[PDB]
Design a protein around this ligand. Structure first.
Ligand SMILES: Nc1nc2c(ncn2[C@@H]2O[C@H](COP(=O)(O)OP(=O)(O)OP(=O)(O)O)[C@@H](O)[C@H]2O)c(=O)[nH]1
Ligand SMILES: [Mn+2]
Ligand SMILES: [Mn+2]
Length: 331
């Protein structure tokens, strides 16, 4: 037996059902590309159940009353087990719409709405986009310029080098300020699409104006290819770093987020993910406890109060959930 919400169960980094979950996640992604948000969430939830299982699913018998495994997801798994392939899934991977939406949405600064608009307008390839520069934002132009490097998985070794230069710049701009690795890498992932960092200072308000200072230092070292500085939402910089390598260099996406220390635990929880884990945690908070959780705080809408947290553990405890360390949040 297994609980209904992903935030009530451990989901480790590696598991026994990668083929099956990958197939369901293709269907989820495709649904998202078509604006079918309900179906996206349903397939995502089913995939996450398989990630939480202790053993491989070898026979259809092994589906067992456990939640979020409706008729459609079950059929997909059945066809994979019986035939080694699911025709609905293969049709999706071969479809020009899916391939193009994946191509476009993977580019830095491009979401589903933009990608779909471009598709509707007859655009199909990266060259097609480069032929219409007036259709691109500066962020998207930078994403295109660096698309090969940004499609290359970011490695732990890259993260460690980036954390060093970010820590050096933060430390030099403001003694006392801290850098925390978040995102998938905090969850134990060996690879990723970007590197996420959360910056704060133990004295509330000393983080004001820190990020532009950190950026100036990084820029003067030749480490920045692109940055977009966004001033109650957190101050942040969406960056492409130029990471030096032996004999070469690689562009790497980095998100730098600044949070005041009072909000830090909520920010760390939100930015650590996984995306599904956080969605589930928020749905759980609202549906089961009547509280609204986000990356800034935990609000009781009836009492009009905010919960004071010193740590992620405090937040889990307040919501009546057993603590899950980040490596068990890989929903
Ligand atoms: N509050 C908030 N959270 C965000 C935002 N963008 C991303 N996140 C969250 O930050 C976490 C990390 O996001 P990603 O970097 O896309 O995903 P990841 O788990 O790090 O996966 P890889 O980067 O591919 O390793 C996830 O929980 C996201 O939901 C944002 O603008 N605001
Ligand atoms: Mn990330
Ligand atoms: Mn990110």
């Amino acid at each position: 037996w297994m609980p209904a919400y992903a935030c009530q169960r451990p989901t480790p980094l590696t598991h026994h059902n990668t083929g099956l979950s990958e197939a369901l996640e293709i269907l989820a992604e495709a649904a998202g590309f078509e604006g079918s948000e309900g179906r996206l969430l349903t397939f995502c939830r089913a995939a996450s159940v398989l990630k939480a299982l202790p053993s491989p699913v070898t026979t259809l018998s092994q589906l067992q009353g456990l939640p979020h495994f409706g008729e459609h997801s079950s059929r997909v798994v059945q066809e994979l087990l019986e035939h080694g392939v699911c025709e609905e899934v293969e049709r999706v991977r071969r479809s020009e719409r899916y391939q193009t939406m994946k191509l476009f949405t993977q580019i830095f600064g491009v979401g589903v709405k933009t990608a779909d608009r471009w598709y509707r307008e007859g655009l199909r390839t990266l060259d097609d986009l480069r032929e219409q520069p007036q259709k691109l934002t500066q962020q998207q132009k930078a994403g295109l310029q660096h698309h090969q490097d940004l499609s290359t998985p970011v490695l732990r070794s890259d993260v460690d080098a980036l954390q060093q230069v970010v820590e050096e710049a933060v430390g030099q701009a403001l003694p006392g300020a801290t850098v925390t690795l978040t995102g998938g890498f905090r969850r134990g992932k060996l690879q990723g699409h970007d590197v996420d960092f959360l910056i704060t200072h133990p004295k509330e308000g000393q983080e004001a104006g820190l990020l532009p200072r950190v950026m100036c230092r990084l820029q003067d070292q030749g480490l920045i290819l692109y940055h977009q500085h966004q001033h109650d939402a957190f101050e942040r910089s969406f960056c492409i770093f130029r990471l030096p390598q032996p004999g070469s260099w690689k562009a790497v996406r980095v998100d730098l987020v600044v949070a005041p220390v009072s909000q830090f635990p909520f920010a760390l929880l939100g930015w650590t993910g996984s995306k599904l884990f956080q969605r589930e945690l928020r749905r759980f908070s609202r549906k089961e406890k009547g509280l609204w959780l986000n990356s800034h705080g935990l609000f009781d809408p009836e009492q009009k109060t905010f919960f004071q947290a010193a740590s992620e553990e405090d937040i889990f405890r307040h919501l009546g959930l057993e603590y899950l360390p980040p490596e068990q949040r890989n929903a």
